[PDB]
Structures are given as C-alpha cells and as structure tokens.
Design an enzyme around this catalytic site. Sequence first.
Site, PDB file in Angstrom:
ATOM      1  CG  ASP A   1       0.274  -3.752   2.775  1.00 32.24           C
ATOM      2  OD1 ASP A   1       0.793  -3.353   1.712  1.00 32.24           O
ATOM      3  OD2 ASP A   1       0.078  -2.997   3.744  1.00 32.24           O
TER       4      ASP A   1
ATOM      5  CG  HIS B   1      -0.417   0.517   2.463  1.00 35.11           C
ATOM      6  ND1 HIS B   1       0.029  -0.328   3.456  1.00 35.11           N
ATOM      7  CD2 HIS B   1      -0.207   1.775   2.921  1.00 35.11           C
ATOM      8  CE1 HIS B   1       0.489   0.386   4.466  1.00 35.11           C
ATOM      9  NE2 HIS B   1       0.359   1.665   4.167  1.00 35.11           N
TER      10      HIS B   1
ATOM     11  CB  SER C   1       2.884   2.176   6.453  1.00 41.80           C
ATOM     12  OG  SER C   1       1.709   2.470   7.189  1.00 41.80           O
TER      13      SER C   1
END
Lengths: 258, 42
Positions: free
Chosen positions: A99, A43, A205
Amino acid sequence: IVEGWDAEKGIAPWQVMLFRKSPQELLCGASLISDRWVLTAAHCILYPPWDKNFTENDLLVRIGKHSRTRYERNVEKISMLEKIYVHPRYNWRENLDRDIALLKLKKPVPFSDYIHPVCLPDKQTVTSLLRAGYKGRVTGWGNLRETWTTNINEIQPSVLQVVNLPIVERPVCKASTRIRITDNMFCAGFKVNDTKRGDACEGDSGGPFVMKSPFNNRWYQMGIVSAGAGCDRKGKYGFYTHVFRLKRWIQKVIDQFG
Amino acid sequence: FHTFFNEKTFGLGEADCGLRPLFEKKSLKDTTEKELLDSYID
Ligand SMILES: *[C@@H]1O[C@H](CO)[C@@H](O)[C@H](O)[C@H]1NC(C)=O
C-alpha cells in the site's frame, strides 16, 4: 490520531497534507522525501469501494502546515502533482499489501524551517531500529476519537497531532486480526490494556512512521500509515507499509521517472 | 551520511535529510524524542 498531543512547530517538517481540490477537503497524510518527491499510501489514491480513484489533477499537497484549516501564509506551500505512481502490485481488491504511492511535484518545493525532507532507511537502519518494542512516531490531522461520540468540530484537531507507538511482534499481530500481514508491512500499537492507547486514524493514512537514529541523529521513515486501529476501525494494532522493503521499487520509479 | 539517489532525478535534499532546522540544527530536542531513544535499548 488518538491519545496524542499537539505538535511543536517544525517537529515534523516532512509532514505533508494530501488535499482534494473540489470539494476542498483534507484527504490523507503524506511525507516529503525530497524537494520534488512525496510518499503516501496507495489506498489514499485508489480504492473504488470508498469511491476513491484520483488523478494528478484531482488533488494537491500542502507542505509546512501546522493548523488543520487556517491558511498559514509565508510558511505553507501548495503544489500541483505532475504524476502519481501507485505500486503495480497494489491490489485494492485483496488486502493492503504494498500500500504505497509516489507523487511527483510540478515544481520543486523550497525548504525552510518548516519544510525539510525525512530520510529513507537502509538495511543497517532497519536491522538496528525496526524491532518489536522500539518506539516510532506518527503525525497527522486525522480525527481524535470515534465518530458519533460528540460534535464533529471536537474530534477534528486544530493543530497537527503526534503520538509515539511501539512496533509490535509480527506473530502477535498476525494473531490479532483476520487480515493478512505480509512481509511488506509491520504493526505498531500499545498492548490490549494500557487503557488510553494511542493510535493513528483514517485521516492519518498515508502519513509517516518515523524513528530517530541514535547513530547519526537523523530521522528515518520506517513506515507509511496504511491502516490505523484508532477511532472507528476495528482492530488492536495499526498496519504500516514497510518502507525499506519497497525501496527498490521507489528507486526504479525515480530512476526512470515512472 | 551515505547518499543513495541522484539529485537530477530525486531532486534536492537527500544529503541533509532527517535533520530538523528547529531542532537537530539548533541542538534543541523536541518534547518526546526521549521516549523514542529510551526504547532503542540493546
Ligand atoms: C478509474 O476511473 C478511470 C477513469 O474513468 C477508469 O478507466 C478506471 O476503470 C477506474 N479505476 C478502477 C480500477 O476502478
């Protein structure tokens, strides 16, 4: 990273900064698994809803860093990307399952006291360390707290942050969110109380969730930060891409070079 | 350490991965390793 502390120089030599070329801006976290390969979240590379659809030329990585902004000469290394491989089964329209993404560097990065790869887990490492209650470590340059709760310059750390988090019981986190947690992810975070609960934020992230093996003394990346519940995001626990479960895919890509 | 990849495709580093130069290599422990190892109870 929320409720964490400043990182000691070289504490996470595998920490990587995924940077945007123009405008120049820290985009995500990532990790060094070899002198030519880097791991980060899918992502971070592809997610249309937040207008994110990058390619090899759109970004670069900074390795060996400590300071979030200051250029650390003779320590950090900048690298262009040769290719990006996001898991084919990653579907930004559904959830964060799988992911994960592999980034290949154009030129091998030289190692130093501040640049060193982390280890990828094996079945043995997973069964002995990836269990509820066991603590792991997350590092990053994400915000220190919820946005709007003070001047921005006071929520963006100056130096790399670190925080230790406990792996959460799968049933317990599946019950804390309407988001689906597949067998390719695991959760981590402190219980709903513990007042000042540490966690990873959006800027974290793609970063690594590491654990130190009491058996061979090495550090292993057990997960990739996929959705931290810190700062502005709703939720009690952070989601991590279960690195081991995707090891075969990592190998497939690397064997063939994508 | 049992290697898993091929350095022609994986690049250098696997054999010596996870061992920090400023820590494990110098027999020095970082500030909080303790918290981690203390949680890996049987
Ligand atoms: C990403 O942008 C490319 C290049 O313009 C385009 O072909 C593709 O549709 C975009 N990706 C997605 C899934 O939106």
